[PDB]
Write a protein that binds this ligand. Sequence first.
Ligand SMILES: C[C@H](O)[C@H](O)[C@H](O)[C@@H](O)C(=O)O
Length: 310
Amino acid sequence: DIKPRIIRFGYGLADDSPTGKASAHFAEVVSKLSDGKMKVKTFGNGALGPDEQLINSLISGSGEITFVSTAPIASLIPEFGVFDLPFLFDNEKVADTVLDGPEGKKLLDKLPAKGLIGLNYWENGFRNITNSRHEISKLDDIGGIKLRVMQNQVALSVFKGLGANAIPMPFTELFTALETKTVDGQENPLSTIQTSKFYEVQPYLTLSNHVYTPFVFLASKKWFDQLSQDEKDVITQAAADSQAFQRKASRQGNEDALKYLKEHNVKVAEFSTEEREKIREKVAPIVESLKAKIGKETVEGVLDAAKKAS
Ligand SMILES: C[C@H](O)[C@H](O)[C@H](O)[C@@H](O)C(=O)O
Protein backbone atom coordinates (compact mmCIF):
# COMPACT_ATOMS: atom_id res chain seq x y z
CA ASP A 1 0.00 0.00 0.00
CA ILE A 2 2.31 2.76 -1.27
CA LYS A 3 0.99 5.58 -3.46
CA PRO A 4 3.24 8.02 -5.42
CA ARG A 5 4.30 10.78 -3.01
CA ILE A 6 6.66 13.80 -3.15
CA ILE A 7 8.39 14.50 0.13
CA ARG A 8 10.25 17.73 0.92
CA PHE A 9 13.39 17.59 3.10
CA GLY A 10 14.85 21.04 3.89
CA TYR A 11 17.92 21.63 6.06
CA GLY A 12 20.45 24.23 7.05
CA LEU A 13 23.93 22.78 6.39
CA ALA A 14 25.63 22.71 3.00
CA ASP A 15 24.68 19.95 0.62
CA ASP A 16 28.17 18.46 0.70
CA SER A 17 28.31 18.23 4.48
CA PRO A 18 28.20 14.67 5.81
CA THR A 19 24.58 15.25 6.92
CA GLY A 20 23.73 16.77 3.51
CA LYS A 21 25.02 13.59 1.88
CA ALA A 22 23.11 11.49 4.41
CA SER A 23 19.91 13.29 3.38
CA ALA A 24 20.54 12.22 -0.21
CA HIS A 25 21.20 8.69 1.12
CA PHE A 26 17.81 8.77 2.82
CA ALA A 27 16.13 10.01 -0.37
CA GLU A 28 17.83 7.14 -2.23
CA VAL A 29 16.78 4.57 0.35
CA VAL A 30 13.18 5.80 0.40
CA SER A 31 13.03 5.51 -3.40
CA LYS A 32 14.35 1.93 -3.47
CA LEU A 33 12.06 0.74 -0.70
CA SER A 34 9.05 2.34 -2.45
CA ASP A 35 9.79 1.14 -6.02
CA GLY A 36 10.54 4.77 -6.79
CA LYS A 37 7.02 5.82 -5.80
CA MET A 38 8.17 7.90 -2.77
CA LYS A 39 10.54 10.62 -3.96
CA VAL A 40 12.27 12.85 -1.41
CA LYS A 41 13.32 16.30 -2.68
CA THR A 42 16.15 17.82 -0.61
CA PHE A 43 16.58 21.60 -0.22
CA GLY A 44 19.97 22.09 1.45
CA ASN A 45 21.90 25.15 2.60
CA GLY A 46 18.99 26.86 4.34
CA ALA A 47 16.84 27.01 1.19
CA LEU A 48 13.67 26.32 3.23
CA GLY A 49 14.95 28.47 6.11
CA PRO A 50 16.78 27.79 9.36
CA ASP A 51 16.06 25.14 11.99
CA GLU A 52 13.37 27.29 13.63
CA GLN A 53 11.42 27.71 10.35
CA LEU A 54 11.93 24.05 9.47
CA ILE A 55 10.45 23.03 12.84
CA ASN A 56 7.36 25.17 12.28
CA SER A 57 6.95 23.94 8.67
CA LEU A 58 6.76 20.38 9.96
CA ILE A 59 4.33 21.55 12.67
CA SER A 60 2.01 23.23 10.15
CA GLY A 61 2.61 20.56 7.48
CA SER A 62 4.24 22.68 4.74
CA GLY A 63 7.32 20.48 5.18
CA GLU A 64 7.55 16.75 5.63
CA ILE A 65 11.05 15.84 6.91
CA THR A 66 14.04 17.64 8.42
CA PHE A 67 17.05 17.30 10.74
CA VAL A 68 17.66 20.04 13.29
CA SER A 69 19.93 20.59 16.27
CA THR A 70 18.41 19.93 19.65
CA ALA A 71 19.00 23.51 20.75
CA PRO A 72 16.08 25.13 18.84
CA ILE A 73 13.81 22.32 20.03
CA ALA A 74 14.24 23.68 23.60
CA SER A 75 11.92 26.52 22.52
CA LEU A 76 9.10 23.94 22.46
CA ILE A 77 10.36 21.25 24.85
CA PRO A 78 12.81 22.71 27.43
CA GLU A 79 14.23 19.30 28.29
CA PHE A 80 16.08 19.30 24.96
CA GLY A 81 18.30 22.07 26.36
CA VAL A 82 20.24 19.39 28.25
CA PHE A 83 22.54 18.84 25.25
CA ASP A 84 23.85 22.44 25.39
CA LEU A 85 25.55 21.76 28.74
CA PRO A 86 29.32 21.46 28.14
CA PHE A 87 31.07 18.12 28.58
CA LEU A 88 28.11 15.78 28.92
CA PHE A 89 29.51 13.10 26.60
CA ASP A 90 33.13 12.00 26.69
CA ASN A 91 32.96 10.74 23.07
CA GLU A 92 30.79 9.53 20.19
CA LYS A 93 30.17 6.05 21.63
CA VAL A 94 28.85 7.48 24.88
CA ALA A 95 26.70 9.77 22.73
CA ASP A 96 25.31 6.93 20.62
CA THR A 97 24.65 4.75 23.67
CA VAL A 98 22.77 7.46 25.55
CA LEU A 99 20.78 8.96 22.66
CA ASP A 100 19.84 5.51 21.36
CA GLY A 101 18.84 4.32 24.84
CA PRO A 102 16.10 5.05 27.35
CA GLU A 103 17.05 8.67 28.11
CA GLY A 104 17.17 9.68 24.45
CA LYS A 105 13.84 7.95 23.85
CA LYS A 106 12.23 9.80 26.76
CA LEU A 107 13.01 13.08 25.01
CA LEU A 108 11.92 11.92 21.57
CA ASP A 109 8.62 10.76 23.14
CA LYS A 110 7.87 14.42 23.97
CA LEU A 111 7.73 15.38 20.28
CA PRO A 112 4.30 14.09 19.14
CA ALA A 113 2.51 16.43 21.57
CA LYS A 114 4.10 19.39 19.74
CA GLY A 115 3.34 17.98 16.30
CA LEU A 116 6.66 16.25 15.49
CA ILE A 117 7.91 12.69 15.18
CA GLY A 118 11.45 12.02 16.35
CA LEU A 119 12.50 9.30 13.89
CA ASN A 120 15.90 8.92 15.57
CA TYR A 121 18.99 10.93 16.48
CA TRP A 122 21.73 11.87 13.99
CA GLU A 123 25.13 13.34 14.73
CA ASN A 124 25.93 17.04 14.50
CA GLY A 125 28.93 16.56 16.76
CA PHE A 126 31.47 18.10 19.09
CA ARG A 127 31.59 21.84 18.62
CA ASN A 128 34.76 23.97 18.26
CA ILE A 129 35.31 27.70 18.72
CA THR A 130 36.28 29.82 15.69
CA ASN A 131 36.79 33.59 15.69
CA SER A 132 38.52 36.47 13.87
CA ARG A 133 39.69 38.57 16.86
CA HIS A 134 42.58 36.69 18.51
CA GLU A 135 43.63 33.12 19.28
CA ILE A 136 41.61 31.41 22.02
CA SER A 137 44.01 29.13 23.91
CA LYS A 138 42.82 30.01 27.45
CA LEU A 139 39.48 30.50 29.18
CA ASP A 140 40.51 34.11 29.68
CA ASP A 141 40.72 34.51 25.90
CA ILE A 142 36.93 34.07 25.67
CA GLY A 143 36.39 37.22 27.71
CA GLY A 144 34.17 39.67 25.90
CA ILE A 145 34.40 37.80 22.59
CA LYS A 146 31.34 38.49 20.44
CA LEU A 147 30.26 34.89 19.96
CA ARG A 148 27.19 33.77 18.06
CA VAL A 149 25.40 30.93 19.84
CA MET A 150 22.37 28.78 19.10
CA GLN A 151 19.02 30.29 20.14
CA ASN A 152 18.45 28.82 23.55
CA GLN A 153 18.60 30.01 27.12
CA VAL A 154 21.04 27.21 27.93
CA ALA A 155 23.52 28.13 25.19
CA LEU A 156 23.26 31.83 25.94
CA SER A 157 23.83 31.37 29.65
CA VAL A 158 26.69 28.89 29.25
CA PHE A 159 28.79 31.19 27.06
CA LYS A 160 28.00 34.39 28.97
CA GLY A 161 29.25 32.62 32.09
CA LEU A 162 32.37 31.79 30.18
CA GLY A 163 32.70 35.55 29.65
CA ALA A 164 31.65 35.95 26.04
CA ASN A 165 29.05 38.35 24.67
CA ALA A 166 26.70 35.66 23.41
CA ILE A 167 24.67 36.55 20.35
CA PRO A 168 21.86 34.09 19.52
CA MET A 169 21.53 33.89 15.75
CA PRO A 170 20.06 31.52 13.17
CA PHE A 171 22.67 29.39 11.46
CA THR A 172 21.46 30.61 8.04
CA GLU A 173 22.63 34.13 8.99
CA LEU A 174 26.02 33.13 10.38
CA PHE A 175 28.39 33.32 7.39
CA THR A 176 27.51 36.99 6.73
CA ALA A 177 27.73 37.86 10.43
CA LEU A 178 31.24 36.39 10.49
CA GLU A 179 32.45 37.97 7.25
CA THR A 180 31.27 41.46 8.28
CA LYS A 181 32.51 41.13 11.89
CA THR A 182 29.04 41.84 13.27
CA VAL A 183 30.04 38.90 15.47
CA ASP A 184 33.63 37.93 16.27
CA GLY A 185 33.19 34.18 16.38
CA GLN A 186 31.10 31.06 16.26
CA GLU A 187 31.05 27.46 17.47
CA ASN A 188 30.28 24.32 15.39
CA PRO A 189 31.80 20.96 14.37
CA LEU A 190 34.85 20.89 12.09
CA SER A 191 33.01 19.39 9.10
CA THR A 192 30.54 22.29 9.33
CA ILE A 193 33.39 24.80 9.79
CA GLN A 194 34.77 23.36 6.58
CA THR A 195 31.62 22.92 4.45
CA SER A 196 29.99 26.24 5.40
CA LYS A 197 33.48 27.77 4.72
CA PHE A 198 33.52 29.64 8.01
CA TYR A 199 37.34 29.17 7.88
CA GLU A 200 37.39 31.67 5.01
CA VAL A 201 36.49 34.42 7.48
CA GLN A 202 37.70 32.93 10.76
CA PRO A 203 41.51 32.92 10.99
CA TYR A 204 41.43 31.26 14.47
CA LEU A 205 40.19 27.78 15.34
CA THR A 206 40.25 26.26 18.84
CA LEU A 207 39.82 22.51 19.31
CA SER A 208 37.66 22.79 22.42
CA ASN A 209 34.98 20.08 21.83
CA HIS A 210 33.02 21.72 24.64
CA VAL A 211 29.44 20.62 23.70
CA TYR A 212 28.07 17.64 21.77
CA THR A 213 25.03 18.42 19.63
CA PRO A 214 22.68 15.63 18.55
CA PHE A 215 20.54 16.16 15.52
CA VAL A 216 16.92 15.04 15.67
CA PHE A 217 15.75 13.49 12.40
CA LEU A 218 12.19 14.85 12.22
CA ALA A 219 8.95 14.10 10.40
CA SER A 220 5.72 16.12 10.50
CA LYS A 221 3.25 14.20 12.70
CA LYS A 222 0.32 15.60 10.72
CA TRP A 223 1.86 14.28 7.52
CA PHE A 224 3.29 11.06 8.97
CA ASP A 225 -0.07 10.06 10.48
CA GLN A 226 -1.81 10.33 7.05
CA LEU A 227 0.62 7.74 5.66
CA SER A 228 -0.11 4.04 5.12
CA GLN A 229 1.54 1.58 7.46
CA ASP A 230 3.58 0.46 4.46
CA GLU A 231 4.48 4.10 3.79
CA LYS A 232 5.52 4.61 7.42
CA ASP A 233 7.73 1.55 7.32
CA VAL A 234 9.50 3.04 4.28
CA ILE A 235 10.24 6.22 6.30
CA THR A 236 11.30 4.45 9.50
CA GLN A 237 13.39 1.80 7.75
CA ALA A 238 14.97 4.56 5.65
CA ALA A 239 15.58 6.57 8.81
CA ALA A 240 17.33 3.64 10.49
CA ASP A 241 19.69 2.96 7.56
CA SER A 242 20.46 6.64 7.02
CA GLN A 243 21.26 7.05 10.73
CA ALA A 244 24.05 4.46 10.46
CA PHE A 245 25.28 5.94 7.17
CA GLN A 246 24.99 9.37 8.78
CA ARG A 247 27.05 8.74 11.87
CA LYS A 248 29.71 7.03 9.83
CA ALA A 249 29.92 9.84 7.31
CA SER A 250 29.99 12.48 10.06
CA ARG A 251 32.94 10.92 11.86
CA GLN A 252 34.93 10.27 8.71
CA GLY A 253 34.00 13.87 7.91
CA ASN A 254 35.39 15.28 11.13
CA GLU A 255 38.67 13.46 10.40
CA ASP A 256 38.80 14.80 6.85
CA ALA A 257 37.80 18.23 8.17
CA LEU A 258 40.69 18.23 10.66
CA LYS A 259 43.17 17.24 7.93
CA TYR A 260 41.83 19.92 5.62
CA LEU A 261 41.79 22.85 8.03
CA LYS A 262 45.31 21.91 9.22
CA GLU A 263 46.70 21.43 5.69
CA HIS A 264 44.98 24.67 4.69
CA ASN A 265 47.04 26.30 7.49
CA VAL A 266 44.16 27.50 9.66
CA LYS A 267 45.69 28.67 12.91
CA VAL A 268 44.57 25.84 15.18
CA ALA A 269 44.87 26.23 18.92
CA GLU A 270 43.91 23.97 21.81
CA PHE A 271 42.99 24.20 25.47
CA SER A 272 45.83 23.25 27.86
CA THR A 273 45.24 20.29 30.19
CA GLU A 274 44.41 22.81 32.93
CA GLU A 275 42.61 25.55 30.93
CA ARG A 276 40.13 22.76 30.25
CA GLU A 277 39.75 22.30 34.01
CA LYS A 278 39.64 26.07 34.47
CA ILE A 279 36.63 25.85 32.12
CA ARG A 280 34.82 23.20 34.19
CA GLU A 281 34.83 25.04 37.54
CA LYS A 282 33.53 28.17 35.78
CA VAL A 283 30.47 26.39 34.37
CA ALA A 284 29.71 23.97 37.24
CA PRO A 285 27.78 26.73 39.06
CA ILE A 286 25.82 28.06 36.06
CA VAL A 287 25.30 24.46 34.91
CA GLU A 288 23.86 23.88 38.38
CA SER A 289 21.72 27.00 37.94
CA LEU A 290 20.50 25.79 34.56
CA LYS A 291 19.09 22.44 35.80
CA ALA A 292 15.87 24.13 36.91
CA LYS A 293 15.31 25.44 33.36
CA ILE A 294 15.95 22.06 31.65
CA GLY A 295 14.32 19.55 34.03
CA LYS A 296 16.13 17.92 36.94
CA GLU A 297 15.03 14.40 36.03
CA THR A 298 16.27 14.95 32.46
CA VAL A 299 19.63 16.40 33.43
CA GLU A 300 20.24 13.77 36.08
CA GLY A 301 19.01 10.88 33.95
CA VAL A 302 21.20 11.92 31.03
CA LEU A 303 24.24 12.35 33.30
CA ASP A 304 23.57 8.96 34.90
CA ALA A 305 23.22 7.34 31.49
CA ALA A 306 26.39 9.09 30.35
CA LYS A 307 28.21 7.78 33.43
CA LYS A 308 27.14 4.17 32.86
CA ALA A 309 28.06 4.27 29.16
CA SER A 310 31.63 5.41 29.83
C1 LIG B 1 20.86 24.23 10.80
C2 LIG B 1 22.02 23.21 11.01
O1 LIG B 1 21.61 22.06 10.28
C3 LIG B 1 22.29 23.05 12.50
O2 LIG B 1 21.22 23.24 13.37
C4 LIG B 1 23.29 24.17 12.93
O3 LIG B 1 24.43 24.20 12.11
C5 LIG B 1 23.79 24.13 14.37
O4 LIG B 1 25.00 23.52 14.65
C6 LIG B 1 23.93 25.62 14.68
O5 LIG B 1 25.12 26.07 14.79
O6 LIG B 1 22.93 26.40 14.78
